[PDB]
Structures are given as C-alpha cells and as structure tokens.
C-alpha cells in the first residue's frame, strides 16, 4: 500500500501533495511542518479544504527529516537535465537520500516533504531511479513519463485547448484535442520531411527511458555499472542514426552530415514550439546559422571553451591510432577486442566508469550542453537550455543526429580497426539457410499514418479532474510474418540465434553500396533463439514478437524500447527497395546462462539488472568491416546467412 | 447596468462566453445566434449549466440580432494567433471590425452590446479587444464605459512568463475569500548586468511607460476607414514630438547609467549588435515572443499571409524619396504637382499614416522598420513563427532596438528642423516676452534640500486575475519594482514691468554635461532637454511668485489612473524624473515664461495629460511648434547660459540624487 501510494507522486506534479491526488480523490495527511513556507500560516485551512470530500486519508509517518540543502539549490521553476554538471550533484544527493530510507513508509514520508520543495522534474527523475533500484519497490511500474509531463512531447497549443476542454466541457462527451503532426517548420524546410520521426512520442520516450535505465552518473557507481553499458551507448545511438538515415533517404534527403568541425555554423535552426508548466516558460529556439560559443554559466557549474572539444576529439583519435588509452598512473591500457568498444563508450559519453575521466573528458555530454546554450553561453540573458539540453526532448532537434553521426564516426574508426570476422568465426557448420522472406504480396511491407490517443488529465495542473484525451498522428506499419528456410545437416538437434536486419538497396545518390558502407545502414529487426531439427526447418516469426520494440499499449517497469509503430522505415509511394538479411549463428557460443525479468526489447535495452543476453558484439555480424573496400554484401554471405529483396510501400492514408 | 455588461466583455479574453465572466460570476445568456462550431451541439446546455450554479450573481439577456455582423477578412485570423497592426492584413481586419462596431445606430445600446458579444465570440481575442476599445473611445454613446486596464486584461504583455504557473497555483490552492500573497517580480528577469543594455531595464520595461505607449497609439492610429478617426489635430507633429521626447528621456537615463546616447540605426544592411530575450509568453497563442540574438540583419520579407512583401531595396528607395523631399522642401503628389513640406506632413509621411500625401512614393518607412526588425528569425515564414516584441505597441519599448529605430526616425525629423529652407530659427520677437523678467528658479522638496530631486525604488501591486484564463477568481497580485521620486515643487520668481497678464510656463531639464563630462553645445543639448511641465498662469503687475507641484505636471497621469486603485494616455507620474545616481548628477533646470498672445489657442473626468496626448475632440492646446523653444537650432546662442540670458527665461543648476532603498507603495492592498 505504501508502495502503491508512491504512484500518487506522479499525479499532477505541479500541484502541492496536500491537494487531492488521483481520480479517486485521495489525500495524504501532510503534517503542518511539511507545508512550504508560503502556506504554513494557512496549513489548518488548506488541510481542511482538500480533506473535505476526500475518499481516503493516507497517514504520513513521523521521520527525522534529511538535509535537503544541496538538492534545494535548483529553483523550483527551472528545467532539469543530467547533462548539466550541477544537476548531476543535486540528483545524486537526492537519489542517495531516497535509497537510504529504511522502509517504504519512511520513503513515502520523505517524498511528501520533498515534493513540496524540490524542482518537480528533478523530484520525478530521482524518485523514478529510487523506485527502479530499491529492493522493497520491485514490481512497481513507473507511470508513463509522457502522461506525467505531456508538454515535453507536443505543441504548446495543445494545452491551451486542453485547459479549455477540461474547464468548459463540464458535462457530456468530449472530443480529443488534435495534436498537429506538422508544426515546427513549413514545407519549405527540407528537414521538416522527417519531423514525423524526430518528434515521435514513442521515439522520444525510448530515448528518455534508455538514459533513465543507463545513467552516466548517479548516487552509487553500481547504478551506473550495468552490463556492457558503454557498448550499448554506442549501439543504441548507432541504430538511431541508421534508422534516421533510412528515413532521410525515403524522403529525398541526403544522409546526415556529422558535426565534426565544432567551429562551423549550424545551418539548420530549430524552433521547438514547446512550453513547460514547471518552468513556466517556453523552450528557447536555436536560430539558423548559430555557432557553438565558449561556456561560462556559474549557476550550471559549467565552464569550458569550444577549443576543449577539439582537444578531447584529438585525444580520442590518438587513443584509437594506438589502440590504447593513457591511464592516471602514467601507463597505458590496451583497447582489447572484447571490451574495447565498451571502454570507448564510457570514455566518450562520458560516464563515471570511464577509465580516465580526468584526461579523456566528457565529450558527448558537453556537445549537448554547447548546442543547448548557443543562445546564452554565459547566462547574461537568464535563458534556459534548448531541447538538445534534455534527453526527453533532444531527439526533436535535427542537430541531435549531426552530433550523434559525429560520435558514431569516432566509434566507427575503432570498429574498422578490428580484424574482419573469419569464416570460421561466422560459420555454423551443418546449418544452411536456403531462403528468407516476408509472408503475404510476398516481401512487401506497408506503412501509413495512424491516429492514437494519449491521456493529458494527469499532467494538466490546476484543472478539474476527468479524462482529457489528445489525438496524435504517427507512422504505422501492417504486421507481417518472416519465413526462414533452413537445412540442419548434422543428424541432431541444434540451437540457433536468428538475427534479422534490413538495409537500403542503394545509397543517397541511388548507387549500390559496398559492404563497408551498407553495414552501417543495417537496422536491427529481431534477435531470438530457435530450435533446429534434422534436416529441413521452416521458421515463422511474427513481427509483433520483435526483440527491438515494445507494444503500443505498454506505453515491473518495462518501458525502455523502440516503439513498435516505428519498427520499419516509412518507405515511399512507389515502393522503397530494401534488403532483408538473416543470419543464424551458433546459440552455444552466443548464450549467457543466467536466471522473473522483463525481457522485452533486449536488443537496444538489454535486460534490467542482468547481463546483456548475447555474447556477440552488439550489431553482429555488421559491426566489423571486410578487408576489401570494394566487397559487397553478396561477397560477405556465408552458408548460414540469406538475403531477400523487399519493398516498403507507403500509403498516404490515415487510419484510427 | 448596461455599462457593467460592456465592461465585462473585457474579462478573461481567452475564455469563451459559455461560462460566467467577472469577479461576480455574471452569465451572458446565450442563444443559437451566439454559438460557434466548437460548441455547436453542446454550447447552450453548458451555458445553462454554468448559469444554474450557486454563486452566479445575475444573467444578462441579450437583444436578438436582426442581422448577423459580417467579418469576411477578420474571421481569417485564428483565435490562437497573435495580432499586430504592423502587419498589413491585420490592419485591414481591424478596419473591418471597427467599421461594424462604429456603424451600430447611436444610442441603441442593447443592439450594440449584442453586436460586440457576437464580435467577441467570433473573433481573435487581441483583435477583438483592440477594435472594441477603439469603438468605445470614438462612439458618442459609450462615454460611461470604462476601458479595462490593459495590464489586468493582457498581463502577459507586461509580466515575466514565470509569474503565471505561480499565479495559477495561488488561485487554485488559496480560496478566493482569503488574500493571496503577491508574487514578487525580480528586478533582473530579462537579463543581468552582464548585459550592458540591462542597466536600462528598469525604464524600458516599466509598466507605466509601456501602458502610455500603448494608449498613445490607440488615441492616434495611423489607419482607419474613417479618416476622422486618424485626422486629430496636429497628429503628425505629435508623432514627431512624443517620440523625440521619448528618445530625449531614454538618453537622459542612458547617461545616468554610464552609457552613451543611443546610436541611430541608419545603415540598414549592417548586423545589429543589440540582443534581447524578452521572457514574455503569449497566453493567446502559447508561443514565446521570438527573441533576437546579437548580429542578425534585416532580410527581405515574404510573408503573404501577413500582407508583408517588401525588400530592403524598397525601404532604401522610400528613404531616398523622403530625403529628397527634405532636401528640396517639396513633396511630390500623385499628379506630379508639388507642395511645401511641413513637420505635420513629414510625420504623416514617415509613419506612415493614411494622411501621407503620397504613399505610393514615400511608402511607410517607420511601420516597416518595426516589421523588418521583428521578423529577422523568420522573414519568409519557413519556421511558422510570429513577430518579436518590437511589433506590438504594448511591448515595443522593452526592446533596446526600439530606441535605435526611433533615434533614426528622430534624426530624419531633426534634419528637417535643421534645414534653413524648411524651418527658420526663432527670432527675438518669437522668443521674448516684453516686460517679464524671471529673477529666480528653484525646486524644493518636503524633507529635501533646495535644488535637489530625490529618487528611490518602489514596489507596487497589479492584479492579474482578469487575464488569467480558466483560473478561479479572486485577486492574484504581482509585485513589481519601479523608479519613483519624492514629491517636489517649482518656485519661479518674476518681475512684470509690462502689460502681460497671462503667460505660459514651460519647464525643461537636461544633464549639465555629456558622455565626456564636458559642457554641451546647445545644438546638441537642445535634443536632450526633456519637457517637465507646460501651463498657463496669470501674472500681476510687479513681483510674481509661481509655485507648481510636481504632481500637477501636464505631462503625466497619476498612479491610480495608469493602474487600478483619454484616461490611459499620459506619462506615468513615477517616471517624471530621471533616475540620477547615488552620488548625484548635475542637471540644468530651464524655465521660460512665453508670450501668451502667441501661445493661446481659442476654443470652447480623469486627468488629461495634454503634452503628449493633446485633448479629446479639441485642438492641441498650445499654438507654438511642439518642443518650443528647443525644437530647432538657435541662431544666436551656442550654449544654454547664453540662450537663457533673455529676460523671460531662467536657468538653475540642480542635482538628481538616487536613494538606493526600496519602499512599498502606500496604495498596495
Ligand atoms: Cu541518447
Ligand atoms: Cu547525445
Ligand atoms: Cu510610438
Ligand atoms: Cu516605432
């Protein structure tokens, strides 16, 4: 109960928790000394006011109050982001306080005290981390972040309308508030052609949830120290960039250009058109042609020149040239075959488990901070950060992909130094995959637009209770089934890892690609274990069972994962040519033996508090190159692999 | 009680007329004629439900509309869009709606109210508010309607966006029967003093000054379908003079803050160094007013939805034409005939107003300067963004760049004043007042020294409840810090040997030294003299003592008129005196007793602040050129001491001293 009572802290985050909570009109018995200074003199009155007609009163246990001086340094009405150095310090302290409470009733009591005092975004974040790690709050799910703070995910005009519906339509049916799909720029903006991907609520949520579950800094290194999280940092973002590039190519745009010269103008501006109720202010835009400028923001404890990014970049290229990193003791640590990419991920992000954070810096994170503050690099204008500044919103900005293509280019310099996989490494003797395909018009995928609803009523502060739906339009695909034909010629049962990817057939200039190029555009569709009899086998796999995605209705905690409706690229009206690829590797050499887990969406998210369930490199078999730069995918193929030409056909039609 | 119904149509502009309006929960009884598609099937039921609630004080029954008002242009502006007369399409919409409201039969007030209710329900709230106010001000039957305080109705135009979530919390948490604590507005919210331009924020962002600016443009619009509305007495000259004095006042403040006189924006292809991040969000549109980063430049405007299709080349052509008119002394008319240029005509050519003699040729330079400057982030609508604060009359004065624009416009007017073939320096007979000898001038303060003005900081409350859409009722105050001064009086002694039995007292002040700490040339200091008062007094034969309280200034309106305790037009009394400095800054007090025979104008509620505002339905009450005697160069004096030797003029060194303390307004609730 106390455990389940915690969920009330995700309801109406800007309303003081002495007010009625939930749709059921419950109140906490907030003690008088918990009331904020401004309300202390009226605490009797307010208590009576909100307790009137309450269906249930929840007692608050008397505790020794913790010292909140550190986390109270963030203004109640500021934005919160982990990218910002001082926000890391404050969040770690508050997480440490939440983790240290002896029991759930004590945790409830301290949460009520904090809710009334702490920045609501920081409170939300730290309470969520605590709920995900405390042994006594296991099997508690975090209420969907997009319904707690829906203004992070849609045009601020939505809330105008929603506040009107909520207050005026006091009886009878309500129509959903329409969420405009095209709103940040005109048709006359090329970048607007892929706004449906950048601004997708499921994609932004996956990004929030991934960083929530794999934080780069926290209260204890053990929260950060998850299995292969450095490598997963690389991979999850490599796949984002792959997916985004396909999308660009479906819409007549060239592939994203990396932001590798940190001094260059950022040609693509972005006007997010978002508003924050917590911060009581709109998000600042970034005008076209803006540049990174030297940072000195005392309030954020960030101070760093653009020059520094060049220094850090050069240090990386040198480490990769030597395949070795400088250590604090003046000696060197090899970048070895098994853990090299993981080390690099932690060096680059960077995270607290970086081998040498002092020297190698915080390159990727500072990139977000530079980009987020081009308009107010020294705080003279008292401006908050742009959307690049917050992991819930950063994917909205075309610049995100330029930054991540740069970061992925660095990781890829290392990946291309690794020895190509030998035939023996790749092969699964006795197993020949004769064909792969998609059932149906065979080998055809269909996409279209779909309208779905999200509930706004939990996140719309100081409005009447009741349902206020909003209706959004997003990409969607028809469901389908893979068919794989395989000969087991050995005389006994074998276990395989089936690995499914797709890539564009041609590049942005309409030309066939070498393997070394195309491999970077292989987007993961599935990974699963499969039993294989003597001799012929027909494997049928449903699109809905993908190891990459989570279902719509999804949105224990089990919220990380690519949204299912974005499993396949938009394609085109004429039919977009892709290659569907399958490999079956030897499961004996891939599996990890280990023990009630949510094992949804393991490809990009791993398995919470377990080992990443595949011994192979993330993105196998495409993470390494071939020796021959003119070699093609056909030249790659080994007997346990198969390819099929497929088409993705977009219908510019909308369903409900 | 019909007048109470009209006043209520101002309330909560972003709310429909489905629910009650006002502190007192008054319902407008809707009928089928008053529905919108949004509420087509449920509207009347909902309205019935709201009026059936316990606390509803009364219900307004509306007269049936025999003919539905037509708004073919104005209905095209979405309700969640921002409205500006600098956009040609928005001006056309405003003229359409004003025409409808003005056309209702005189004294048919139930028909008028139903027409206005219909307009409100079917139109954009900023557009409605502007047009309704213009109609209330100009109709002959609406004399008893109080135009609601603009800062109470659209407080987002005046506040820090960050006040609003706090306001909504206060209204929701504390019941309306119990006072809510004022929300304190920081002194430094648009910037800190890391930004040098931020030193002037106290002045630029002052609510009283921005309210005045808004009301001036309301009284003196540049366009209407009815030329009678635009063609008020000497409005072109007043456009010059009012803005010249705004620039003079801002320049006085700049010199009190270690800054220089504002630099005109005359090289229109260069980048603009001044940034400004206004911190204002529209409650109508949900959009932040787009800021301006340093180093932007004007770009050709291609925004056909706004009616803006104009290039920098066009602006440069118009400016060449105006400069040629000034250089020759002649304006070219549409038939190619000429006419002699005067200051009133030039004001109308520059703005431009519909009174321009040749709009095809001279364009509308000042209005387009606002446009260009407000859209540098989105000149072709690629980004689906709207205009910056510089394009709204209520907000424009907040932006440092407003002053660069107006410094150039003023420089254009000064080029006309300084050109001997256009304007002749005053002769002795125009300046003198035979027999009148000013023997001393002083200022005195209760609790103060002789010849010292004392300034300080004050915190005052404004109620934002009426503008807070969908909040519970009851006052919610924002508490803001503004400049103020201790009350003072002028004491002027004069010996009258001759026959004058009346005179106009004209009082101006200016800093004694320039940016170099050096005495001014009069040719420069004349543009720094800020008019403080102007008033007619009797003179007796022999010795006279003229005493005038600072509170009597014909420039200003009292606090209780600017704010809730031509009503809104007038400089706020708390900004009458420049800030000065803690150490004290030397100023020069100039007083003139001018010849009434040449001053007089012969012509037959609230305080009327005629210096900037003129008088409703009357001629501007002083016959002299606006800014006299400093509107033009002297032909016989190169410094103010020599200028002032004339018998009817006096000059006295004073000190403006800031006391850096903050006190509460005694008028606060
Ligand atoms: Cu990320
Ligand atoms: Cu990133
Ligand atoms: Cu003006
Ligand atoms: Cu102007």
UniProtKB/Swiss-Prot annotation, chain A:
Belongs to the tyrosinase family. SUPFAM superfamilies: Di-copper centre-containing domain, E set domains, Hemocyanin, N-terminal domain. It is an enzyme of class 1 (oxidoreductase). GO terms for biological process: defense response; melanin biosynthetic process from tyrosine; positive regulation of melanization defense response. It comes from Manduca sexta. One of its GO terms (molecular function) is tyrosinase activity. Synthesized by oenocytoids, a type of hemocyte, and released into the hemolymph plasma. Cu cation A binds at residues 207, 211, 237. It is found in: Secreted. The N-terminus is blocked. Activated by immulectin and lipopolysaccharide. The active site is at 349 (proton acceptor). Disulfide bonds join 558-598, 560-605. Its cofactor is Cu(2+). This is Phenoloxidase subunit 1. It comes from the Eukaryota. Heterodimer. Forms a complex with an interleukin 1-like protein as a consequence of a host defense response. The lineage of its organism: Eukaryota, Metazoa, Ecdysozoa, Arthropoda, Hexapoda. Its main location: secreted. Keywords: Copper, Disulfide bond, Melanin biosynthesis, Metal-binding, Monooxygenase, Oxidoreductase, Secreted. PANTHER family: LARVAL STORAGE PROTEIN/PHENOLOXIDASE, PHENOLOXIDASE 2-RELATED. GO terms for cellular component: extracellular region. It catalyses: 2 L-dopa + O2 = 2 L-dopaquinone + 2 H2O; L-tyrosine + O2 = L-dopaquinone + H2O. Its EC number is 1.14.18.1.
UniProtKB/Swiss-Prot annotation, chain B:
This is a copper-containing oxidase that functions in the formation of pigments such as melanins and other polyphenolic compounds. Catalyzes the rate-limiting conversions of tyrosine to DOPA, DOPA to DOPA-quinone and possibly 5,6 dihydroxyindole to indole-5'6 quinone. Binds to the surface of hemocytes and is involved in hemocyte melanization. The keyword Disulfide bond applies. Cu cation A binds at residues 213, 217, 243. InterPro entries: Di-copper_centre_dom_sf, Hemocyanin/hexamerin, Hemocyanin/hexamerin_mid_dom, Hemocyanin_C, Hemocyanin_C_sf, Hemocyanin_N, Hemocyanin_N_sf, Ig_E-set. Belongs to the tyrosinase family. The keyword Secreted applies. GO terms for biological process: defense response; melanin biosynthetic process from tyrosine; positive regulation of melanization defense response. Binds 2 copper ions per subunit. Keywords: Copper, Disulfide bond, Melanin biosynthesis, Metal-binding, Monooxygenase, Oxidoreductase, Secreted. GO terms for molecular function: chloride ion binding; copper ion binding; tyrosinase activity. It catalyses: 2 L-dopa + O2 = 2 L-dopaquinone + 2 H2O; L-tyrosine + O2 = L-dopaquinone + H2O. The N-terminus is blocked. The active site is at residue 351. Disulfide bonds join 567-606, 569-613. This is Phenoloxidase subunit 2. GO terms for cellular component: extracellular region. Activated by immulectin and lipopolysaccharide. Its EC number is 1.14.18.1. It is found in: Secreted. Cu cation B binds at residues 366, 370, 406. Heterodimer. Forms a complex with an interleukin 1-like protein as a consequence of a host defense response. The lineage of its organism: Eukaryota, Metazoa, Ecdysozoa, Arthropoda, Hexapoda. Its cofactor is Cu(2+). Synthesized by oenocytoids, a type of hemocyte, and released into the hemolymph plasma.
């Amino acid at each position: 109960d106390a455990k389940n009572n915690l969920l009330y802290f995700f309801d109406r985050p800007n309303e003081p928790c002495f007010m009625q909570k939930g749709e059921d009109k419950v109140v906490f018995e907030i003690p008088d000394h918990y009331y904020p200074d401004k309300y202390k003199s009226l605490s009797n009155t307010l208590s009576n006011r909100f307790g009137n007609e309450a269906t249930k009163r929840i007692p608050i246990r008397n505790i020794t109050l913790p010292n909140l001086e550190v986390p109270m340094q963030l203004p109640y009405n500021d934005q919160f982001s982990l990218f910002v150095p001082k926000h890391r310090t404050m969040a770690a302290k508050l997480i440490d306080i939440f983790m240290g409470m002896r029991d759930v009733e004590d945790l409830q009591s301290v949460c009520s005290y904090c809710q009334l005092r702490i920045n609501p975004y920081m409170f939300n974040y730290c309470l969520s981390v605590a709920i995900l790690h405390r042994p006594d709050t296991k099997g508690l799910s975090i209420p969907t972040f997009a319904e707690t703070f829906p203004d992070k995910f849609m045009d601020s005009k939505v809330f105008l309308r929603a506040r009107e519906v909520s207050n005026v339509v006091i009886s009878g049916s309500r129509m959903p508030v329409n969420v405009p799909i095209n709103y940040t720029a005109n048709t006359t903006e090329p970048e607007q052609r892929v706004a449906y991907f950048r601004e997708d609520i499921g994609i932004n949520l996956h990004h929030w949830h991934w960083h929530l579950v794999y934080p780069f800094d926290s209260a204890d290194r053990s929260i950060v120290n998850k299995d292969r999280r450095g490598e997963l940092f690389y991979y999850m973002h490599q796949q984002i960039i792959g997916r985004y590039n396909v999308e660009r190519m479906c819409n007549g745009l060239p592939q994203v250009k990396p932001f590798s010269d940190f001094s260059a103008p950022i040609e693509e501006g972005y006007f997010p058109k978002l508003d924050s109720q917590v911060a009581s202010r709109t998000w600042p835009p970034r005008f076209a042609g803006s540049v990174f400028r030297n940072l000195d923001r005392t309030v954020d404890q960030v101070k760093i020149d653009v020059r520094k990014l060049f220094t850090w970049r050069d240090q990386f290229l040198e480490a990769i040239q030597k395949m070795a990193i400088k250590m604090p003791n003046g000696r060197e640590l090899p970048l070895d075959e098994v853990t090299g990419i993981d080390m690099l991920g932690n060096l680059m992000e960077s995270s607290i488990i970086s081998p040498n954070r002092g020297y190698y810096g915080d390159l990727h994170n500072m990139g977000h901070v530079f980009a987020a503050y081009t308009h107010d690099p020294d705080h003279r204008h008292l401006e908050q950060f742009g959307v690049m500044g917050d992991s819930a919103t950063a994917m909205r900005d075309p610049f995100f992909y330029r930054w991540h293509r740069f970061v992925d280019d660095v990781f890829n310099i290392y990946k291309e130094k690794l020895t190509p996989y030998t035939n023996e490494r790749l092969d699964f003797p006795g197993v020949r995959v004769s064909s792969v395909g998609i059932e149906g018009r065979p080998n055809t995928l269909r996409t279209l637009w779909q309208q779905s609803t999200v509930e706004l009523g939990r996140g719309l502060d100081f409005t009447p209770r009741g349902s206020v739906l909003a209706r959004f339009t997003h990409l969607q695909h028809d469901e389908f089934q893979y068919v794989i034909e395989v000969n087991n010629t050995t005389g006994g049962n074998l276990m395989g890892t089936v690995r499914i990817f797709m890539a564009p057939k041609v590049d942005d200039n309409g030309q066939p690609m070498s393997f070394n190029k195309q491999r970077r555009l292989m987007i993961e569709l599935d990974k699963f274990s499969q039993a294989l009899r003597p001799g012929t086998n027909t494997i049928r796999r449903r699109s809905v069972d993908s190891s990459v995605t989570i279902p719509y209705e999804r949105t224990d905690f089990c919220g990380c994962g690519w949204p299912h409706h974005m499993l396949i690229p938009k394609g085109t009206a004429q039919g977009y040519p892709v290659v569907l690829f399958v490999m079956i590797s030897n499961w004996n050499n891939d599996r990890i033996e280990q023990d009630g887990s949510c094992n949804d969406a393991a490809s990009y998210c791993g398995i919470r508090d377990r080992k990443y369930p595949d011994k192979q490199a993330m993105g196998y078999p495409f993470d390494r190159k071939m020796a021959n730069d003119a070699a093609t995918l056909s030249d790659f193929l080994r007997p346990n692999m198969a390819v099929r030409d497929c088409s993705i056909q977009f219908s510019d039609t909308t369903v409900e | 009680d019909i007048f109470d119904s009209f006043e209520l149509l101002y309330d909560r502009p972003g709310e429909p007329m489905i629910n009650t309006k006002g502190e007192d929960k008054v319902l407008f009884e809707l009928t089928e004629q008053f529905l919108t598609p949004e509420y087509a099937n449920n509207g009347l039921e909902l309205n019935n439900r709201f009026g059936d609630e316990e606390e509803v004080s009364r219900k307004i029954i509306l007269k049936n509309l025999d003919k539905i008002p037509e708004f073919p242009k104005a209905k095209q502006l979405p309700n969640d869009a921002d409205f500006s007369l600098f956009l040609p399409s928005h001006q056309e919409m405003a003229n359409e709606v004003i025409d409808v409201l003005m056309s209702v039969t005189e004294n048919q007030l139930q028909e008028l109210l139903s027409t206005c209710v219909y307009a409100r329900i079917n139109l954009n709230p900023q557009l409605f508010n502007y047009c309704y106010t213009v109609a209330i001000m100009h109709r002959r039957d609406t004399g008893k309607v109080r135009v609601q305080n603009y800062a109470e109705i659209f407080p987002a135009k005046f506040l820090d966006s960050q006040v609003f979530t706090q306001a909504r919390e206060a209204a929701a948490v504390i019941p309306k029967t119990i006072p809510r604590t004022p929300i304190i507005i920081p002194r430094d919210y648009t910037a800190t003093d890391l930004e040098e331009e931020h030193r002037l924020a106290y002045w630029r962002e002052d609510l009283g000054i921005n309210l005045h600016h808004w009301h001036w443009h309301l009284v003196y619009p540049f366009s209407a379908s009815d030329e009678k509305i635009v063609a008020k007495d000497r409005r072109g000259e007043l456009f010059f003079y009012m803005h010249q004095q705004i620039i003079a006042r801002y320049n006085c403040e700049r010199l009190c803050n270690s800054l220089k006189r504002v630099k005109k924006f005359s090289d229109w292809r260069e980048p603009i160094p001044e940034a400004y991040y206004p911190k204002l969000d529209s409650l109508t549109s949900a959009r932040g007013w787009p800021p301006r980063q340093a180093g932007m430049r004007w770009q050709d405007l291609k925004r056909p939805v706004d009616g803006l299709n104009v290039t920098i080349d066009d602006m440069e052509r118009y400016r060449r034409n105006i400069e040629e008119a000034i250089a020759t002394g002649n304006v070219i008319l549409p038939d190619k005939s000429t006419k002699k240029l005067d200051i009133d005509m030039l004001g109308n050519m520059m703005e431009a107003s519909v009174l321009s003699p040749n709009r095809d040729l001279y364009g509308s330079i000042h209005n387009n300067m606002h446009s260009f400057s407000a859209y540098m982030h989105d000149p072709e609508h690629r980004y689906l963004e709207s205009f910056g604060v510089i394009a709204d009359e209520a907000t424009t004065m907040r932006d440092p760049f407003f002053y660069r624009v107006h410094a150039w416009v003023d420089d254009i007017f000064q080029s006309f004043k300084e050109a001997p073939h256009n304007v002749r320096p005053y002769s002795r007979s125009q300046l003198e007042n035979p027999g009148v000898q000013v023997t001393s001038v002083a200022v005195e303060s209760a609790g103060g020294q002789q010849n010292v003005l004392n300034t300080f900081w004050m915190q005052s409350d404004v109620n934002l409840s009426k503008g807070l859409d969908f909040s519970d009722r009851g006052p919610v105050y924002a508490r803001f810090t503004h400049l103020n001064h201790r009350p003072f009086r002028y004491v002027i002694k004069a010996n009258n040997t001759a026959s004058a039995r009346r005179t106009t007292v004209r009082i101006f002040i200016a800093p004694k030294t320039d940016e170099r700490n050096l005495p001014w040339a009069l040719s420069d200091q004349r543009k720094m003299f800020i008019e403080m008062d102007r008033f007619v007094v009797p003179l007796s034969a022999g010795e006279n003592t003229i005493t005038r309280q600072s509170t009597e200034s014909s420039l200003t309106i009292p606090f209780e008129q600017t704010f809730r305790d031509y009503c809104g037009c007038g400089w706020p009394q708390h900004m009458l005196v420049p800030k000065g400095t803690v150490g004290g800054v030397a100023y020069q007090l100039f007083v003139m007793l001018s010849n009434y025979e040449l001053d007089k104008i012969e012509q037959p509620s609230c305080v009327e602040a005629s210096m900037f505002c003129g008088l409703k339905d009357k001629k501007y009450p002083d016959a002299r050129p606006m800014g006299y005697p400093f509107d033009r160069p002297s032909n016989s004096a190169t410094n103010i001491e020599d200028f002032s030797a004339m018998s009817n003029m006096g000059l006295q060194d004073i000190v403006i001293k800031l006391s850096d303390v903050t006190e509460p307004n005694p008028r606060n609730p």
